[PDB]
Design a protein around this nucleic acid. Structure first.
Lengths: 113, 100, 127, 150, 98
RNA sequence: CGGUCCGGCCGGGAACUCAAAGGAGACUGCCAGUGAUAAACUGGAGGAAGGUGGGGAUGACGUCAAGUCAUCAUGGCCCUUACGACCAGGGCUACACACGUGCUACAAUGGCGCAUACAAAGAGAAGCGACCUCGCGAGAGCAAGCGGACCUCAUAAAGUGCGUCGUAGUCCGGAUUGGAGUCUGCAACUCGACUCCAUGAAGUCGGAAUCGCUAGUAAUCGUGGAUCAGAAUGCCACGGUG
């Protein structure tokens, strides 16, 4: 449960579903257990917490959750005030990486008319 | 070739002597803005921005029969078509087609 | 007697010597009795010499320069087929059956009055 | 309207002496590199040992005889007229087409290395249960639409 | 030691210039009999056939640049004057060095 | 051929490459066919190559109210206390609607860390910039040698062979995302380049219609040259495999 998200898998072991939950892959959550010293023993049908807290900084390189979903959106704190046009483009369906706004836009704005 | 761009090309040579010679040693010491973070020579810092047109920016060598930036050979100053005229007159030294 | 040949392939060049009587199999001062025994071109030069059979009653020397091992094989093989057709006239007949009586040059030709990269024709009209 | 050939010189295999076993490499190769195809030929014969491999002292020259292209349709006229009739592919082309038919099936198996994929498809062609044939089934129907010709 | 620089855009004119300075050297005492030709260079140039909107179609022109230095072990009272007064030939650049 | 730090190295040599150039070879000659047995063509033998040997470089008559007031010339007409040159702002990426041409992955014939083999074209004095240290790196300190075949740019990559993950929308693949470094410049607001990361949507060769090439051709992976205050995968060349 928890570690890289807010999810509690029902009646399964502690390491389950620590994968695909954004910012974490499918394979490192199993391929790093030996480096972390984790065993898959003492299996119970109910929640536990604060036993594998060390795993958080092995499944992710820098950040999870958190953190991650707003640190990957940090630029708005310095763009969304007064007549800033990169801010206005971000409030709208428009790109801000330097890319042109009239072309290659139907993913961010929506389908063609 | 534009007479105002020809006259500017002459003014540039006479200003490279003025704003681009014997100023580089001063420019190396006045351009630092972190080593003390203190402001004490602002008039001399704004002197490095005095030249606007006489520095290696804007300056292009160009085709010397049209003023054009395009389609020329700087080893002769001639265009990729006036080189055919001058080679057909022997007027570019040793440059030939066959006859060897 | 002494028999000799030259061979050339895309900036690789070889000279070959062949003599009757016991000897060695040598390339650029190294013996093929232990050298080149893993390299990806070691057999593609030996088939013309299987017309006379090596070492026991034959001596070989190869000297080569330039090109990768695949290109050196073509150059060395032409040096061998020239030296071997000059070794005996009944071997010329067996090399002729294998087509080894021609020099392969196949140069890249020159570009004429435009047409982009050498000759590659661009895309078509509206149409 | 003028050529007339010119068959061009080709280098037969150095160890098996065969032109057909060198011809296979020209179709097995990718991006003109050829060297990896030269590492897959005969390496696919040690894997084929455990299976239905035909004449091992002939490598693939007899196993290619279990792959059966025979006819070609479309892009044709007869008697000056448009006709949907089949023609029989030239014997010097039939095996070079069979080479593409087997390497294009073998590389598109979803498992193991090419040396194993090709040994499976050559064993399964020797019992006519092979993969990648539905892509040419509508052509085989068009070849069976006519037996009376012109 | 001194060197006499001869530069030309043709492989026959550099040998005519070599024969002209050897003919003059034999006529000022002795100073040059058969100098070394050095390595060669080429420069290739393209020109356009139509003055506008076709730059794909070009024609090719060439210069073959030669260099000779002559090299002298001991100059004379005639090397420093009579060989310097030489007018040589048209199409060739002559310089004294060092 | 002589000596051998056992090496083209050194003696010494013009053999073989080779650099700057000049010749020879091929005559349908020879066999056998084709055909007003003519004119004119086609197989075979030999040869490195043969039937204008091939490929360039050579642009008749011309086609059409041919293109261009934007290379340049210049009438008619206009602006001339300016629509002129000069400055500082901006506009040809504002986004309500949108498109050629061209390229990259779709694998294990891979992705990654090592071992390992072979280049041409060229290019440089307010130039290329070394040796050696520092900077995760872009770069910086610094200033030999060479006027450019005993100096500088510059260890080309695809390819060859181990180890390792594995058919998992993929341990392959690429849009996002957030900041800091290096170089230059009025200026890095904004559509600078070079440099180091984390997140990983899409992608299983793609509907209709449709392009290139007869052989060192088509295909394919890298490296130079030119532009350049700072700015490419484009423009033009060249080599490896084929």
């Amino acid at each position: 449960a928890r570690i890289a998200g807010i999810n509690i898998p029902d009646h399964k072991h502690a390491v389950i579903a620590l994968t695909s939950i954004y910012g974490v892959g499918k394979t490192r959550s199993k391929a790093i257990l030996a480096a972390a010293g984790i065993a898959e023993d003492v299996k119970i049908s109910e929640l536990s917490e604060g036993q594998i807290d060390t795993l958080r900084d092995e499944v992710a390189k820098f950040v999870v959750e958190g953190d991650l979903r707003r640190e990957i959106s940090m630029s708005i704190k310095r763009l969304m005030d007064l007549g800033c046009y990169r801010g206005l483009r971000h409030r709208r369906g428009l790109p801000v990486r330097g890319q042109r706004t009239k072309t290659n836009a139907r993913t961010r704005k929506g389908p063609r008319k | 070739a534009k007479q105002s761009m020809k006259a500017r090309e002459v003014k540039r040579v006479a200003l490279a002597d003025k704003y681009f010679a014997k100023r580089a040693e001063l420019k190396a010491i006045i351009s630092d803005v972190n080593a003390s973070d203190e402001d004490r020579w602002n008039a001399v810092l704004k002197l490095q921005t005095l030249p606007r047109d006489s520095s290696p920016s804007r300056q292009r060598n160009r085709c010397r029969q049209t003023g054009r930036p395009h389609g020329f050979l700087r080893k002769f100053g001639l265009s990729r078509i006036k080189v055919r005229e001058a080679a057909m007159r022997g007027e570019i030294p040793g440059l030939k087609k066959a006859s060897w | 007697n002494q028999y000799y040949g030259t061979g050339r392939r895309k900036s690789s060049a070889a000279r070959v010597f062949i003599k009757p009587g016991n000897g060695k199999i040598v390339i650029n001062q190294r013996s093929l009795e232990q050298y080149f025994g893993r390299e990806t071109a070691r057999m593609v030069v030996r088939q013309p010499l299987e017309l006379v059979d090596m070492v026991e009653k034959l001596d070989l020397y190869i000297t080569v320069k330039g090109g990768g091992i695949s290109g050196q094989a073509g150059a060395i093989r032409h040096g061998i087929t020239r030296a071997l057709m000059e070794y005996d006239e009944s071997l010329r007949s067996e090399l002729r059956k294998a087509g080894f009586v021609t020099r392969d040059a196949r140069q890249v030709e020159r570009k004429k009055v435009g047409l982009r990269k050498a000759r590659r024709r661009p895309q078509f009209s509206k149409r | 309207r003028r050529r007339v050939i010119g068959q061009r010189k080709i280098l037969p295999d150095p160890k098996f002496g065969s032109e057909l076993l060198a011809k296979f490499v020209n179709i097995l190769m990718v991006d003109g590199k050829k060297s990896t195809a030269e590492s897959i030929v005969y390496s696919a014969l040690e894997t084929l040992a455990q299976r239905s491999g035909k004449s091992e002292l002939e490598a693939f020259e007899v196993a290619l005889e279990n792959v059966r292209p025979t006819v070609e349709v479309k892009s044709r006229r007869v008697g000056g007229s448009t006709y949907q009739v089949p023609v029989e592919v030239r014997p010097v082309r039939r095996n070079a087409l069979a080479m593409r038919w087997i390497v294009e099936a073998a590389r598109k198996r979803g498992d193991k290395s090419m040396a194993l994929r090709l040994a499976n498809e050559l064993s399964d062609a020797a019992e006519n249960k092979g993969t990648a044939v539905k892509k040419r089934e509508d052509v085989h129907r068009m070849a069976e639409a006519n037996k009376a010709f012109a | 030691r001194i060197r006499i620089r001869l530069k030309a855009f043709d492989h026959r004119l550099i040998d005519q210039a070599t024969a002209e300075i050897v003919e003059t050297a034999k006529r000022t005492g002795a100073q040059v009999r058969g100098p070394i030709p050095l390595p060669t260079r080429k420069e290739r140039f393209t020109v356009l056939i139509s003055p506008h909107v076709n730059k794909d179609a070009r024609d090719q022109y060439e210069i073959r640049t030669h260099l000779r230095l002559v090299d002298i072990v001991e100059p004379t009272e005639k090397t420093v004057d009579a060989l310097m007064r030489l007018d040589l030939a048209a199409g060739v650049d002559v310089q004294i060095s060092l």
